[PDB]
Amino acid sequence: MDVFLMIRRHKTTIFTDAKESSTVFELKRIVEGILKRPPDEQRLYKDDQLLDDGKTLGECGFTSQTARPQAPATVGLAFRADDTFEALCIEPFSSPPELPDVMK
Amino acid sequence: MMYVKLISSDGHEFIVKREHALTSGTIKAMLSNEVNFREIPSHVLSKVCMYFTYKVRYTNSSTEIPEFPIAPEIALELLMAANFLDC
Amino acid sequence: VLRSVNSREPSQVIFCNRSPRVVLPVWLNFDGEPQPYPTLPPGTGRRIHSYRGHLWLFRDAGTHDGLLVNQTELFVPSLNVDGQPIFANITLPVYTLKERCLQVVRSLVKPENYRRLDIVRSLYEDLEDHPNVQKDLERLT
Ligand SMILES: CC(=O)N[C@@H](C)C(=S)N1C[C@H](O)C[C@H]1C(=S)NCc1ccc(-c2scnc2C)cc1
């Protein structure tokens, strides 16, 4: 079963998919191809929870019925510059305007 | 699978499969690996990228198709984007 | 042109609404005129008597948005194999993002206020040109 994801760091957002049975480490290999940074310089998060390389996405709560195409699940990303990892930072999207009078 | 970059007016960089982005005829013309959108904010373009994923998944599929959701707050801006992009 | 054939050979059918919309069945009669039938709530089904060679199509009962039936526009009852009813699975199509956006805007704004919205004049005409059964019948011709 496929799960559909947004992998997000700063003002960067990757749309991709994977199997429930695939691992956190295998997802880092997908990021390596796009963003050109090896797995050992990456940290992946479900909200404020660091994810272990060996665990499957299904064990970390990304299931096919919650992580949908029209509404994918978010996975935090954080790189290592030289020695230490940076703090997790996900810039929010822009705010919509107020509903016009006619749509109220 | 080749990926492309779609950049919103406020600077968010969205990275999606080329195949998915080619759903839009307008985007195909802008390419034929990055494309900047001066009029589309990130809260519209994030929904646009989700529609691509939805469209490829459920096109030519017999399994039951669910409703593509759109909040009232984003309908106007999203209508104008879909019209420009032709998708 | 698009009209039911008068076969008089009975055909039992199951209308099954596998969409989130309230469904309006429409039978195209012997002169080609659309006849509306009682509505089906979301996720419900009904066993009905029709005939072979009769044409049917299906719409959203509130907005007349187009729906599919067994993957396609029209449904025609066929010969019942071993006295078993023909299944007519009604579903959503994969709408375009534009048409989906127009559906949501139409459902929030009243027809009179369409021209007050801050958009190009072509989008007023796209909004006002709301889905219609008689337009699509000319389109399938
Ligand atoms: C001689 C002839 O063919 N007459 C026509 C008018 C008949 S009897 N028709 C037209 C269609 O083939 C269907 C059939 C009718 S009117 N069947 C009765 C019927 C009643 C209600 C329903 C529906 S549709 C949604 N809910 C119901 C209860 C379906 C069929």
Numbering used by the authors:
A (entry chain A): 1 to 104
B (entry chain B): 16 to 47, 58 to 112
C (entry chain C): 62 to 202
Please give sentences taken from the publication describing this entry.
Hydroxyproline is the key recognition element of small molecules targeting the von Hippel-Lindau (VHL) E3 ligase, which are of interest as probes of hypoxia signaling and ligands for PROTAC conjugation. The modified Hyp residue is crucial also for the recognition of the hypoxia inducible factor 1 alpha subunit (HIF-1α), the natural substrate of VHL. Herein we report the synthesis of VHL ligands bearing thioamide substitutions at the central hydroxyproline moiety, and characterize their binding by fluorescence polarization, isothermal titration calorimetry, X-ray crystallography and molecular modeling. The new structures revealed that the noncovalent interaction network between the compounds and VHL residues was fully conserved and consistent with those observed with previous inhibitors.
To obtain the final doubly substituted compound, deprotected intermediate 6 was reacted with thioamide derivative A to give intermediate 9 (49%). Boc deprotection of this intermediate followed by acylation led to the final thioamide derivative 4 (64%). In contrast, ligand 2 (single right-hand side thioamide) showed a greater loss in binding affinity (10-fold loss by FP, and 20-fold loss by ITC). Double substitution in ligand 4 resulted in the weakest binder of this series, with Kd > 10 μM. The presence of the thioamide on the left-hand side of Hyp resulted in Tyr112 bending slightly to accommodate the bulkier group. An increase in hydrogen bond distances was observed for compounds 2 and 4 (3.0 ± 0.1 and 2.95 ± 0.05 Å for O–H⋯SC groups, respectively) compared to 1 and 3 (2.52 ± 0.05 Å for O–H⋯OC groups, on both compounds). We therefore evaluated the interaction energy of each protein amino acid in the complexes with its surrounding to determine differences in relative EMM-GBSA compared to reference inhibitor 1. The results, shown in Table 1, indicate that the loss in binding affinity observed in compounds 2 and 4 is largely contributed by destabilization of Tyr98 and, to a much lesser extent, of Tyr112, especially in compound 4. Conversely, full thioamide replacement in compound 1 to yield compound 4 led to an unexpected 2% decrease on the trans isomer as observed by NMR.
